[PDB]
Structure formats: C-alpha cells, structure tokens
Amino acid sequence: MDFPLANLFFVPSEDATAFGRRLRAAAQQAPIVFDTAFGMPILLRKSHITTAYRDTATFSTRMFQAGILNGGLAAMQGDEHARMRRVYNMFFLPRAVSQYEERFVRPISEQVVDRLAGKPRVDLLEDFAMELPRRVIGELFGFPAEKLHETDERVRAMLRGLVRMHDPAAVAESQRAYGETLGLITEVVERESRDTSDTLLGEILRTLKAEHMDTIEASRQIVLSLILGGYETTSWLVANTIHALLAHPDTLARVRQDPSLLPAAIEEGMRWCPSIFGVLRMVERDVRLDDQALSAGTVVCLAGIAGNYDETAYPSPEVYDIDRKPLPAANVFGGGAHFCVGAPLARMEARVGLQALLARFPGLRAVPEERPSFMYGAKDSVAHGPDKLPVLLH
Numbered sequence: 001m002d003f004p005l006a007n008l009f010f011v012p013s014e015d016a017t018a019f020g021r022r023l024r025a026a027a028q029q030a031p032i033v034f035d036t037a038f039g040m041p042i043l044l045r046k047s048h049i050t051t052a053y054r055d056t057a058t059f060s061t062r063m064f065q066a067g068i069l070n071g072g073l074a075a076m077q078g079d080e081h082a083r084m085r086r087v088y089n090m091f092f093l094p095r096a097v098s099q100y101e102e103r104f105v106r107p108i109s110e111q112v113v114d115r116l117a118g119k120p121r122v123d124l125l126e127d128f129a130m131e132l133p134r135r136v137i138g139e140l141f142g143f144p145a146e147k148l149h150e151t152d153e154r155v156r157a158m159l160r161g162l163v164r165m166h167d168p169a170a171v172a173e174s175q176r177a178y179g180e181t182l183g184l185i186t187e188v189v190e191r192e193s194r195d196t197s198d199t200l201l202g203e204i205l206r207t208l209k210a211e212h213m214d215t216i217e218a219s220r221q222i223v224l225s226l227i228l229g230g231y232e233t234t235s236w237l238v239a240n241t242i243h244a245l246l247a248h249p250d251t252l253a254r255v256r257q258d259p260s261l262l263p264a265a266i267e268e269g270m271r272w273c274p275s276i277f278g279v280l281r282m283v284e285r286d287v288r289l290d291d292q293a294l295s296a297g298t299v300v301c302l303a304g305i306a307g308n309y310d311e312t313a314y315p316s317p318e319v320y321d322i323d324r325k326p327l328p329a330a331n332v333f334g335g336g337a338h339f340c341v342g343a344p345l346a347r348m349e350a351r352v353g354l355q356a357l358l359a360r361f362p363g364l365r366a367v368p369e370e371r372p373s374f375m376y377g378a379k380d381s382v383a384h385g386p387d388k389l390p391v392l393l394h
C-alpha cells in the first residue's frame with residue numbers, strides 16, 4: 001500500500017462533530033490515506049485539493065462518463081462543460097432564486113410545517129427535511145410529490161453507484177434504478193416539453209432549446225439532477241442544519257427571534273456538520289503531489305471538508321458558533337469549475353424552510369434521551385447525516 005490506512009467514514013456517533021474531527025486528525029497525520037471501507041484514496045491536504053480543483057486536465061470528472069450521469073453536466077469536461085454550465089447557471093441566478101422563493105418555496109414551506117402541528121412529536125428528518133425539497137421539485141416539474149416519494153429507494157440506489165464506482169454491484173444497481181425511473185423522467189420531459197407547458201422545468205427546457213442545447217439526453221439529465229440534487233441532496237443539508245440548531249437551544253432561540261441569522265446558521269452548519277462525504281475526481285495521468293504519487297486512472301476523493309476542523313482557520317472547531325466572521329467558506333459544494341451549480345437553491349430552501357419551522361413552533365426542542373446517530377450512509381444515502389430528528393413541538 002502506497003498510503004496509510006484510515007477509517008474516516010464508517011464510524012457512527014451521536015456527536016455530529018465526530019466526522020469533521022476524524023478528517024482533521026487524519027489530515028494532521030498524512031496528506032493521503034486509503035480508506036479501506038470506502039475503498040479509495042482520500043486527499044486531505046488543502047494545497048493538494050485546491051491544486052486538484054484547478055487542474056482539470058489532471059483531475060477530471062470523467063469517471064461519470066461510465067455511469068448514469070453520462071450525458072449530463074457533471075460528466076462534461078473543458079469547453080463542453082463550460083457551455084452547459086453557463087446554461088444551468090441561468091436557472092440559479094439571484095433574481096431567479098428570489099422568484100422561486102416567492103412563488104414556490106415560501107408557500108410550500110408554510111404548508112409543510114402546518115402539517116406537523118397536530119402532533120406532540122415528529123421526526124423532522126422524514127417529515128420536514130425530506131418533505132420540503134421533494135415538494136419543491138414536485139412543483140417545479142408540475143408533477144405530484146407523492147409520486148416522487150415512491151422513488152426514494154431508486155434515488156438512493158442511483159446515488160450509491162455514483163460514489164463508489166469501483167464497486168460493480170453498486171454501479172449495476174445504479175443503472176437498474178435509473179432504468180426503473182426512466183419512465184417517470186420521460187413522462188415529465190414530454191409533458192413539460194409541450195409549447196403549452198407552464199413550469200420552471202418548461203422554461204428550462206425552452207431555454208435549453210433557445211441556447212441550442214436541447215437534446216432528449218440533456219432534458220433527461222436536468223430532470224435527473226433536479227431529483228438527485230434538488231430533492232435528495234438538499235434534504236441532508238436541511239437535516240444537518242436543524243440538528244445543529246436543536247443541539248444548541250440557545251442558538252436556536254436567537255435564530256427564531258432574529259431570522260436574519262439564518263444564513264450564518266446554515267453556513268456554520270456546513271462547516272460544523274458537513275452533509276457530503278467528499279468530492280470525486282479521476283486522475284488522468286501519473287501525478288506527484290509533493291512526495292505522494294497517484295497513478296493514471298485512479299478515482300480519488302478530495303476531502304476539502306477536512307479543512308472544516310482546521311483550528312488555525314476556525315478556533316474551537318467543535319463549537320457550533322454562528323457568530324464566526326467572516327463566515328466559513330463552504331467546502332460541501334466542491335470547487336473549481338464543477339462547484340455545485342444548484343447551491344443557491346439549496347441554500348434558499350434551507351433558509352426559507354427553517355424560517356417557517358421556527359416561526360410556527362416556538363416550543364420546538366429535541367426529544368430527550370432519543371439522540372440521533374450520525375454516519376455516512378444514513379438511510380442508505382451517500383450523505384453524512386442523522387438517522388432521525390425526533391422533536392417535541394408543543
């Protein structure tokens with residue numbers, strides 16, 4: 001073995017900081033480790049990670065060409081990638097996001113939190129963090145949220161093949177699950193591809209055609225990204241933010257009384273309890289990073305989130321401190337040219353949804369003695385997140 005062994009991902013804890021602390025401790029011992037359970041090298045050194053994000057010819061996203069994302073944005077390189085990213089970015093510009101907030105997200109958030117009011121105890125993971133992003137996507141598609149709820153097993157099977165692609169069983173199951181969702185995706189595209197379509201998805205598909213990029217594969221892939229990113233991945237950001245607040249009731253009270261603190265609560269939450277495992281790249285040629293060597297063809301995990309607990313940048317990093325200024329730079333969206341294009345929507349949903357929740361329930365508090373457990377792979381996902389978020393509402 002070229003690298004020391006590590007066990008960074010497959011350790012559960014009731015302490016949501018355990019993952020960030022493990023990443024930092026490992027980074028202090030070695031720049032690159034081999035995670036036996038996850039099954040690939042993990043880059044932990046900031047200089048290597050930032051270098052890798054910028055050198056896309058050496059560290060590509062081409063591993064996505066072998067699976068269900070082939071034909072989509074993430075699998076593109078170079079100028080092809082830049083052209084399609086410019087079109088996707090149009091849908092996440094500030095004015096567009098503000099319109100989604102007024103038209104979809106705030107009203108849906110109010111309905112989601114309303115549905116919780118008749119119960120003394122609820123699980124905010126299933127009944128809030130997952131529900132709100134699902135319903136937003138259902139309304140973007142002009143499509144029933146209840147029908148999207150039935151895809152959960154398929155969504156997570158799709159995702160598991162996108163993170164550990166050295167596992168042929170996981171890859172095949174991702175392909176199987178995509179094939180079992182293709183009927184739904186096709187129906188959504190065809191309905192919203194009509195000239196009489198009145199959805200954001202309809203506008204996206206028209207804009208795709210006005211920008212000369214409107215193949216059927218492009219339409220399927222934007223729908224797929226909105227399901228996998230817009231619903232599932234966003235849910236874990238909402239979940240981890242809620243936990244950070246529930247675990248710090250004095251901070252939760254401050255944020256309820258001053259909702260202008262919500263952006264900081266979300267950004268600090270991304271530092272304190274990141275919801276991603278890391279970010280994949282493919283090494284395209286033999287490369288040396290200081291005294292480390294990586295071989296052509298190797299898929300690696302960039303762990304920029306190992307900097308979340310760098311105490312030289314963020315003193316007392318195990319403290320959830322929404323007052324850190326400047327706010328910590330987010331590492332959960334990747335970096336360089338591939339930095340998540342959907343981040344503005346995810347951030348806005350977390351803010352608007354939490355604003356609705358905290359306003360509706362002045363009594364919100366974690367259930368004592370039913371502590372969430374945090375680990376990579378929660379609910380068979382590819383996120384670091386809780387298994388449950390039980391709360392008392394009144």
Ligand code: HEM
Binds near residue numbers: 229278337340
């Ligand atoms: C509106 C919701 C979302 C949508 C539509 C979305 C969509 C996408 C798309 C299309 C890409 C590929 C970008 C490219 O390669 O140029 C991407 C990448 C990514 N997204 Fe998202 N996403 C969403 C939410 C999130 C959230 C909530 C997180 C994490 C908290 C996240 C983390 C990432 C990461 C880590 C990447 C990889 C970036 C890289 O390779 O450097 N996404 N997303």
Ligand SMILES: N[C@@H](Cc1c[nH]c[nH+]1)C(=O)O
Binds near residue numbers: 159225229
């Ligand atoms: N991993 C899926 C879903 C996702 C979007 N953003 C973060 N995750 C994808 O790359 O599309």
